[PDB]
Amino acid sequence: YNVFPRTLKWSKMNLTYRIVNYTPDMTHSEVEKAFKKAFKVWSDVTPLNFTRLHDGIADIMISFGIKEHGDFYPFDGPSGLLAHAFPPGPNYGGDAHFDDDETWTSSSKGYNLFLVAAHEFGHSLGLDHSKDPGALMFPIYTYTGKSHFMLPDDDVQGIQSLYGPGDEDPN
Ligand SMILES: COc1ccc(S(=O)(=O)N(Cc2cccnc2)[C@@H](C(=O)NO)C(C)C)cc1
Ligand SMILES: [Ca+2]
Ligand SMILES: [Ca+2]
Ligand SMILES: [Zn+2]
Ligand SMILES: [Zn+2]
């Protein structure tokens, strides 16, 4: 049973994460919405368990990425790359990093963390992608997390069904 390596949705009904998008044009209050609110929408599509244990137990997080890997250069102006997320494995999984050279906000101008973040998190915690037809995963985001409707049902029901109940049980 193996074909397209894109799903990672089975044994992860609950996970922890950290909120630290950035403080460019928004304030601690906005980032609070970006990370929380965007999470409110992600939870709306799927009852995913998320906990930010500052104690040091986080798997995914929202934060502006700044070239710190050592392989490919993510940050790069408005280039085709606003949010790169990693697989929830080591302490660098579900790492939601936005091309620091891009723009992010919680208002009607630019990428709304609700959208971008709900999208990056959907990846960092979800998997490679899941919107062939239409979901909050393609390089297009136009409709904010809630600026019209769940057009991207692919990500809505997609993770609402795959990330819904977790298994983490080998038969
Ligand atoms: C809200 O929907 C979107 C979220 C994030 C992006 S992105 O960060 O610009 N980007 C999409 C993309 C850009 C260029 C080429 N291919 C894809 C991310 C992404 O997919 N994040 O989930 C890339 C860098 C992986 C776009 C829309
Ligand atoms: Ca870019
Ligand atoms: Ca991590
Ligand atoms: Zn990064
Ligand atoms: Zn995507």
Side-chain angles (χ1 to χ4, degrees), residues 9 42 118-123 126-132 134-141 152 154-156 159:
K9 250 129 84 152
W42 175 240
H119 183 125
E120 196 47 31
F121 261 62
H123 269 11
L127 69 123
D128 256 309
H129 259 94
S130 79
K131 79 290 110 82
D132 228 25
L136 168 107
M137 317 290 264
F138 34 34
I140 201 95
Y141 51 102
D154 263 56
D155 93 90
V156 176
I159 96 301

PDB file of all heavy atoms in Angstrom, residues 9 42 118-123 126-132 134-141 152 154-156 159:
ATOM      1  N   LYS A   9      -1.474  11.907   7.701  1.00  0.00           N
ATOM      2  CA  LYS A   9      -2.658  12.159   8.571  1.00  0.00           C
ATOM      3  C   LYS A   9      -3.191  10.831   9.115  1.00  0.00           C
ATOM      4  O   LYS A   9      -4.050  10.207   8.522  1.00  0.00           O
ATOM      5  CB  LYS A   9      -3.693  12.822   7.661  1.00  0.00           C
ATOM      6  CG  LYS A   9      -3.855  14.290   8.058  1.00  0.00           C
ATOM      7  CD  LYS A   9      -3.708  15.174   6.820  1.00  0.00           C
ATOM      8  CE  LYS A   9      -5.048  15.252   6.087  1.00  0.00           C
ATOM      9  NZ  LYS A   9      -5.028  16.569   5.389  1.00  0.00           N
ATOM     10  N   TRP A  42      -8.838  26.574  11.605  1.00  0.00           N
ATOM     11  CA  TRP A  42      -8.298  25.196  11.424  1.00  0.00           C
ATOM     12  C   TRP A  42      -9.088  24.229  12.304  1.00  0.00           C
ATOM     13  O   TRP A  42      -9.385  23.116  11.916  1.00  0.00           O
ATOM     14  CB  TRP A  42      -6.842  25.285  11.879  1.00  0.00           C
ATOM     15  CG  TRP A  42      -6.211  23.931  11.850  1.00  0.00           C
ATOM     16  CD1 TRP A  42      -5.688  23.301  12.923  1.00  0.00           C
ATOM     17  CD2 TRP A  42      -6.016  23.032  10.719  1.00  0.00           C
ATOM     18  NE1 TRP A  42      -5.180  22.082  12.521  1.00  0.00           N
ATOM     19  CE2 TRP A  42      -5.357  21.870  11.175  1.00  0.00           C
ATOM     20  CE3 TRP A  42      -6.340  23.113   9.359  1.00  0.00           C
ATOM     21  CZ2 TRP A  42      -5.028  20.825  10.311  1.00  0.00           C
ATOM     22  CZ3 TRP A  42      -6.014  22.065   8.481  1.00  0.00           C
ATOM     23  CH2 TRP A  42      -5.357  20.922   8.959  1.00  0.00           C
ATOM     24  N   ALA A 118      -3.188  29.592   8.611  1.00  0.00           N
ATOM     25  CA  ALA A 118      -4.053  28.370   8.567  1.00  0.00           C
ATOM     26  C   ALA A 118      -3.573  27.461   7.438  1.00  0.00           C
ATOM     27  O   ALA A 118      -3.696  26.254   7.491  1.00  0.00           O
ATOM     28  CB  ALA A 118      -5.468  28.868   8.287  1.00  0.00           C
ATOM     29  N   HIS A 119      -3.019  28.049   6.422  1.00  0.00           N
ATOM     30  CA  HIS A 119      -2.505  27.264   5.270  1.00  0.00           C
ATOM     31  C   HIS A 119      -1.163  26.618   5.636  1.00  0.00           C
ATOM     32  O   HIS A 119      -0.977  25.423   5.501  1.00  0.00           O
ATOM     33  CB  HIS A 119      -2.352  28.310   4.174  1.00  0.00           C
ATOM     34  CG  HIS A 119      -1.916  27.643   2.913  1.00  0.00           C
ATOM     35  ND1 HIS A 119      -2.617  27.796   1.738  1.00  0.00           N
ATOM     36  CD2 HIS A 119      -0.868  26.807   2.625  1.00  0.00           C
ATOM     37  CE1 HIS A 119      -1.996  27.073   0.802  1.00  0.00           C
ATOM     38  NE2 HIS A 119      -0.919  26.446   1.285  1.00  0.00           N
ATOM     39  N   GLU A 120      -0.236  27.399   6.117  1.00  0.00           N
ATOM     40  CA  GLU A 120       1.079  26.834   6.510  1.00  0.00           C
ATOM     41  C   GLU A 120       0.861  25.759   7.572  1.00  0.00           C
ATOM     42  O   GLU A 120       1.284  24.631   7.420  1.00  0.00           O
ATOM     43  CB  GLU A 120       1.869  28.020   7.073  1.00  0.00           C
ATOM     44  CG  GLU A 120       3.356  27.668   7.135  1.00  0.00           C
ATOM     45  CD  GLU A 120       3.791  27.043   5.810  1.00  0.00           C
ATOM     46  OE1 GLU A 120       3.220  27.396   4.793  1.00  0.00           O
ATOM     47  OE2 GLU A 120       4.682  26.218   5.838  1.00  0.00           O
ATOM     48  N   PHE A 121       0.180  26.090   8.633  1.00  0.00           N
ATOM     49  CA  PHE A 121      -0.090  25.075   9.682  1.00  0.00           C
ATOM     50  C   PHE A 121      -0.748  23.859   9.034  1.00  0.00           C
ATOM     51  O   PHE A 121      -0.362  22.731   9.265  1.00  0.00           O
ATOM     52  CB  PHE A 121      -1.047  25.760  10.655  1.00  0.00           C
ATOM     53  CG  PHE A 121      -0.269  26.275  11.840  1.00  0.00           C
ATOM     54  CD1 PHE A 121       0.731  27.238  11.657  1.00  0.00           C
ATOM     55  CD2 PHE A 121      -0.545  25.786  13.120  1.00  0.00           C
ATOM     56  CE1 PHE A 121       1.454  27.712  12.759  1.00  0.00           C
ATOM     57  CE2 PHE A 121       0.179  26.258  14.221  1.00  0.00           C
ATOM     58  CZ  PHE A 121       1.179  27.221  14.041  1.00  0.00           C
ATOM     59  N   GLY A 122      -1.731  24.087   8.202  1.00  0.00           N
ATOM     60  CA  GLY A 122      -2.398  22.947   7.518  1.00  0.00           C
ATOM     61  C   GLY A 122      -1.320  22.060   6.903  1.00  0.00           C
ATOM     62  O   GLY A 122      -1.465  20.856   6.814  1.00  0.00           O
ATOM     63  N   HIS A 123      -0.228  22.645   6.491  1.00  0.00           N
ATOM     64  CA  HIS A 123       0.875  21.836   5.890  1.00  0.00           C
ATOM     65  C   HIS A 123       1.805  21.304   6.986  1.00  0.00           C
ATOM     66  O   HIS A 123       1.868  20.118   7.244  1.00  0.00           O
ATOM     67  CB  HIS A 123       1.633  22.810   4.993  1.00  0.00           C
ATOM     68  CG  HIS A 123       1.061  22.760   3.608  1.00  0.00           C
ATOM     69  ND1 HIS A 123      -0.128  22.109   3.324  1.00  0.00           N
ATOM     70  CD2 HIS A 123       1.495  23.282   2.416  1.00  0.00           C
ATOM     71  CE1 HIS A 123      -0.367  22.256   2.010  1.00  0.00           C
ATOM     72  NE2 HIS A 123       0.592  22.965   1.407  1.00  0.00           N
ATOM     73  N   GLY A 126      -0.314  19.076   8.702  1.00  0.00           N
ATOM     74  CA  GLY A 126      -1.044  18.153   7.786  1.00  0.00           C
ATOM     75  C   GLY A 126      -0.051  17.324   6.977  1.00  0.00           C
ATOM     76  O   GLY A 126       0.330  16.240   7.371  1.00  0.00           O
ATOM     77  N   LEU A 127       0.365  17.819   5.844  1.00  0.00           N
ATOM     78  CA  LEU A 127       1.326  17.043   5.006  1.00  0.00           C
ATOM     79  C   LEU A 127       1.722  17.834   3.755  1.00  0.00           C
ATOM     80  O   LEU A 127       1.421  19.004   3.626  1.00  0.00           O
ATOM     81  CB  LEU A 127       0.570  15.771   4.625  1.00  0.00           C
ATOM     82  CG  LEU A 127      -0.565  16.128   3.668  1.00  0.00           C
ATOM     83  CD1 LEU A 127      -0.401  15.335   2.372  1.00  0.00           C
ATOM     84  CD2 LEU A 127      -1.908  15.781   4.317  1.00  0.00           C
ATOM     85  N   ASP A 128       2.407  17.199   2.841  1.00  0.00           N
ATOM     86  CA  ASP A 128       2.841  17.900   1.596  1.00  0.00           C
ATOM     87  C   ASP A 128       1.746  18.842   1.091  1.00  0.00           C
ATOM     88  O   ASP A 128       1.912  20.045   1.066  1.00  0.00           O
ATOM     89  CB  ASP A 128       3.090  16.781   0.585  1.00  0.00           C
ATOM     90  CG  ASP A 128       4.597  16.571   0.424  1.00  0.00           C
ATOM     91  OD1 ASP A 128       5.290  17.550   0.203  1.00  0.00           O
ATOM     92  OD2 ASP A 128       5.030  15.436   0.528  1.00  0.00           O
ATOM     93  N   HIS A 129       0.630  18.303   0.693  1.00  0.00           N
ATOM     94  CA  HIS A 129      -0.483  19.161   0.187  1.00  0.00           C
ATOM     95  C   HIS A 129      -1.774  18.346   0.091  1.00  0.00           C
ATOM     96  O   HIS A 129      -1.812  17.181   0.432  1.00  0.00           O
ATOM     97  CB  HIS A 129      -0.053  19.617  -1.211  1.00  0.00           C
ATOM     98  CG  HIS A 129       0.475  21.025  -1.144  1.00  0.00           C
ATOM     99  ND1 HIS A 129       1.826  21.305  -1.000  1.00  0.00           N
ATOM    100  CD2 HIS A 129      -0.154  22.245  -1.194  1.00  0.00           C
ATOM    101  CE1 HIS A 129       1.963  22.643  -0.968  1.00  0.00           C
ATOM    102  NE2 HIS A 129       0.786  23.264  -1.083  1.00  0.00           N
ATOM    103  N   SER A 130      -2.824  18.949  -0.386  1.00  0.00           N
ATOM    104  CA  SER A 130      -4.116  18.218  -0.523  1.00  0.00           C
ATOM    105  C   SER A 130      -5.172  19.158  -1.101  1.00  0.00           C
ATOM    106  O   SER A 130      -6.179  19.431  -0.476  1.00  0.00           O
ATOM    107  CB  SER A 130      -4.498  17.799   0.896  1.00  0.00           C
ATOM    108  OG  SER A 130      -5.069  18.909   1.577  1.00  0.00           O
ATOM    109  N   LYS A 131      -4.949  19.669  -2.280  1.00  0.00           N
ATOM    110  CA  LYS A 131      -5.945  20.603  -2.873  1.00  0.00           C
ATOM    111  C   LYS A 131      -5.980  20.488  -4.394  1.00  0.00           C
ATOM    112  O   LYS A 131      -6.323  21.430  -5.080  1.00  0.00           O
ATOM    113  CB  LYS A 131      -5.468  21.995  -2.449  1.00  0.00           C
ATOM    114  CG  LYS A 131      -4.304  22.449  -3.339  1.00  0.00           C
ATOM    115  CD  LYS A 131      -3.057  21.622  -3.019  1.00  0.00           C
ATOM    116  CE  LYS A 131      -2.750  20.685  -4.189  1.00  0.00           C
ATOM    117  NZ  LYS A 131      -2.011  21.525  -5.170  1.00  0.00           N
ATOM    118  N   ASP A 132      -5.621  19.353  -4.924  1.00  0.00           N
ATOM    119  CA  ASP A 132      -5.628  19.180  -6.407  1.00  0.00           C
ATOM    120  C   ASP A 132      -6.774  19.969  -7.052  1.00  0.00           C
ATOM    121  O   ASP A 132      -6.559  20.717  -7.984  1.00  0.00           O
ATOM    122  CB  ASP A 132      -5.815  17.679  -6.640  1.00  0.00           C
ATOM    123  CG  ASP A 132      -4.781  17.188  -7.654  1.00  0.00           C
ATOM    124  OD1 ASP A 132      -3.742  17.819  -7.764  1.00  0.00           O
ATOM    125  OD2 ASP A 132      -5.045  16.189  -8.304  1.00  0.00           O
ATOM    126  N   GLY A 134      -9.217  22.020  -5.178  1.00  0.00           N
ATOM    127  CA  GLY A 134      -9.366  23.383  -4.576  1.00  0.00           C
ATOM    128  C   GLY A 134      -9.329  23.325  -3.042  1.00  0.00           C
ATOM    129  O   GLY A 134     -10.299  22.970  -2.402  1.00  0.00           O
ATOM    130  N   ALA A 135      -8.227  23.696  -2.451  1.00  0.00           N
ATOM    131  CA  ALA A 135      -8.116  23.693  -0.960  1.00  0.00           C
ATOM    132  C   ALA A 135      -7.146  24.787  -0.489  1.00  0.00           C
ATOM    133  O   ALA A 135      -6.404  25.346  -1.269  1.00  0.00           O
ATOM    134  CB  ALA A 135      -7.547  22.323  -0.612  1.00  0.00           C
ATOM    135  N   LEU A 136      -7.127  25.072   0.788  1.00  0.00           N
ATOM    136  CA  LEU A 136      -6.187  26.101   1.318  1.00  0.00           C
ATOM    137  C   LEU A 136      -4.771  25.512   1.309  1.00  0.00           C
ATOM    138  O   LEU A 136      -4.118  25.393   2.325  1.00  0.00           O
ATOM    139  CB  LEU A 136      -6.689  26.375   2.747  1.00  0.00           C
ATOM    140  CG  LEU A 136      -5.661  27.185   3.550  1.00  0.00           C
ATOM    141  CD1 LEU A 136      -6.152  28.622   3.740  1.00  0.00           C
ATOM    142  CD2 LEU A 136      -5.482  26.541   4.926  1.00  0.00           C
ATOM    143  N   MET A 137      -4.311  25.112   0.153  1.00  0.00           N
ATOM    144  CA  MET A 137      -2.956  24.496   0.052  1.00  0.00           C
ATOM    145  C   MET A 137      -2.234  24.972  -1.215  1.00  0.00           C
ATOM    146  O   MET A 137      -1.030  25.127  -1.232  1.00  0.00           O
ATOM    147  CB  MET A 137      -3.216  22.991  -0.028  1.00  0.00           C
ATOM    148  CG  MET A 137      -4.290  22.588   0.989  1.00  0.00           C
ATOM    149  SD  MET A 137      -3.619  22.719   2.663  1.00  0.00           S
ATOM    150  CE  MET A 137      -3.150  20.982   2.850  1.00  0.00           C
ATOM    151  N   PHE A 138      -2.957  25.200  -2.277  1.00  0.00           N
ATOM    152  CA  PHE A 138      -2.297  25.660  -3.538  1.00  0.00           C
ATOM    153  C   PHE A 138      -1.532  26.966  -3.290  1.00  0.00           C
ATOM    154  O   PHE A 138      -1.655  27.565  -2.241  1.00  0.00           O
ATOM    155  CB  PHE A 138      -3.423  25.871  -4.568  1.00  0.00           C
ATOM    156  CG  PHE A 138      -4.693  26.378  -3.919  1.00  0.00           C
ATOM    157  CD1 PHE A 138      -4.638  27.243  -2.818  1.00  0.00           C
ATOM    158  CD2 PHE A 138      -5.934  25.986  -4.434  1.00  0.00           C
ATOM    159  CE1 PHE A 138      -5.822  27.713  -2.236  1.00  0.00           C
ATOM    160  CE2 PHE A 138      -7.118  26.455  -3.853  1.00  0.00           C
ATOM    161  CZ  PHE A 138      -7.062  27.320  -2.753  1.00  0.00           C
ATOM    162  N   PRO A 139      -0.756  27.367  -4.265  1.00  0.00           N
ATOM    163  CA  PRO A 139       0.027  28.620  -4.134  1.00  0.00           C
ATOM    164  C   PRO A 139      -0.911  29.827  -4.136  1.00  0.00           C
ATOM    165  O   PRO A 139      -0.504  30.946  -3.895  1.00  0.00           O
ATOM    166  CB  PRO A 139       0.926  28.614  -5.368  1.00  0.00           C
ATOM    167  CG  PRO A 139       0.204  27.760  -6.357  1.00  0.00           C
ATOM    168  CD  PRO A 139      -0.531  26.713  -5.561  1.00  0.00           C
ATOM    169  N   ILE A 140      -2.171  29.604  -4.398  1.00  0.00           N
ATOM    170  CA  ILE A 140      -3.142  30.733  -4.406  1.00  0.00           C
ATOM    171  C   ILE A 140      -3.889  30.778  -3.068  1.00  0.00           C
ATOM    172  O   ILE A 140      -4.199  29.756  -2.486  1.00  0.00           O
ATOM    173  CB  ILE A 140      -4.093  30.432  -5.571  1.00  0.00           C
ATOM    174  CG1 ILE A 140      -4.776  31.726  -6.014  1.00  0.00           C
ATOM    175  CG2 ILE A 140      -5.154  29.418  -5.137  1.00  0.00           C
ATOM    176  CD1 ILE A 140      -4.005  32.328  -7.190  1.00  0.00           C
ATOM    177  N   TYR A 141      -4.165  31.950  -2.569  1.00  0.00           N
ATOM    178  CA  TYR A 141      -4.873  32.054  -1.257  1.00  0.00           C
ATOM    179  C   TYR A 141      -6.041  33.037  -1.334  1.00  0.00           C
ATOM    180  O   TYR A 141      -6.946  32.996  -0.527  1.00  0.00           O
ATOM    181  CB  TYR A 141      -3.821  32.586  -0.297  1.00  0.00           C
ATOM    182  CG  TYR A 141      -3.171  33.818  -0.876  1.00  0.00           C
ATOM    183  CD1 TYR A 141      -3.554  35.082  -0.419  1.00  0.00           C
ATOM    184  CD2 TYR A 141      -2.182  33.699  -1.857  1.00  0.00           C
ATOM    185  CE1 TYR A 141      -2.952  36.228  -0.944  1.00  0.00           C
ATOM    186  CE2 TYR A 141      -1.576  34.845  -2.385  1.00  0.00           C
ATOM    187  CZ  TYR A 141      -1.961  36.111  -1.927  1.00  0.00           C
ATOM    188  OH  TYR A 141      -1.365  37.243  -2.446  1.00  0.00           O
ATOM    189  N   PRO A 152     -12.067  26.163  -0.425  1.00  0.00           N
ATOM    190  CA  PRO A 152     -11.035  25.108  -0.296  1.00  0.00           C
ATOM    191  C   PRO A 152     -11.550  23.952   0.564  1.00  0.00           C
ATOM    192  O   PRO A 152     -10.899  23.521   1.493  1.00  0.00           O
ATOM    193  CB  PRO A 152      -9.878  25.819   0.391  1.00  0.00           C
ATOM    194  CG  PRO A 152     -10.480  26.979   1.105  1.00  0.00           C
ATOM    195  CD  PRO A 152     -11.720  27.367   0.353  1.00  0.00           C
ATOM    196  N   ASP A 154     -11.396  21.074   0.092  1.00  0.00           N
ATOM    197  CA  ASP A 154     -10.378  19.998   0.088  1.00  0.00           C
ATOM    198  C   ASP A 154      -9.591  20.025   1.388  1.00  0.00           C
ATOM    199  O   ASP A 154      -9.333  19.004   1.989  1.00  0.00           O
ATOM    200  CB  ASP A 154      -9.466  20.293  -1.105  1.00  0.00           C
ATOM    201  CG  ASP A 154      -9.916  19.452  -2.295  1.00  0.00           C
ATOM    202  OD1 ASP A 154     -11.075  19.553  -2.661  1.00  0.00           O
ATOM    203  OD2 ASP A 154      -9.097  18.717  -2.820  1.00  0.00           O
ATOM    204  N   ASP A 155      -9.229  21.185   1.839  1.00  0.00           N
ATOM    205  CA  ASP A 155      -8.475  21.272   3.106  1.00  0.00           C
ATOM    206  C   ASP A 155      -9.468  21.197   4.257  1.00  0.00           C
ATOM    207  O   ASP A 155      -9.190  20.646   5.301  1.00  0.00           O
ATOM    208  CB  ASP A 155      -7.749  22.624   3.041  1.00  0.00           C
ATOM    209  CG  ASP A 155      -8.579  23.722   3.719  1.00  0.00           C
ATOM    210  OD1 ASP A 155      -8.408  23.914   4.911  1.00  0.00           O
ATOM    211  OD2 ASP A 155      -9.369  24.349   3.035  1.00  0.00           O
ATOM    212  N   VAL A 156     -10.641  21.731   4.055  1.00  0.00           N
ATOM    213  CA  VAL A 156     -11.667  21.676   5.131  1.00  0.00           C
ATOM    214  C   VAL A 156     -12.017  20.220   5.435  1.00  0.00           C
ATOM    215  O   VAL A 156     -11.591  19.659   6.424  1.00  0.00           O
ATOM    216  CB  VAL A 156     -12.875  22.396   4.554  1.00  0.00           C
ATOM    217  CG1 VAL A 156     -14.030  22.312   5.551  1.00  0.00           C
ATOM    218  CG2 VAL A 156     -12.521  23.863   4.296  1.00  0.00           C
ATOM    219  N   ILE A 159      -8.786  17.489   5.837  1.00  0.00           N
ATOM    220  CA  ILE A 159      -8.223  17.207   7.191  1.00  0.00           C
ATOM    221  C   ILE A 159      -9.343  16.965   8.199  1.00  0.00           C
ATOM    222  O   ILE A 159      -9.135  16.362   9.232  1.00  0.00           O
ATOM    223  CB  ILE A 159      -7.368  18.422   7.606  1.00  0.00           C
ATOM    224  CG1 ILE A 159      -8.173  19.397   8.486  1.00  0.00           C
ATOM    225  CG2 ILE A 159      -6.828  19.159   6.375  1.00  0.00           C
ATOM    226  CD1 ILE A 159      -9.403  19.904   7.737  1.00  0.00           C
TER     227      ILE A 159
END
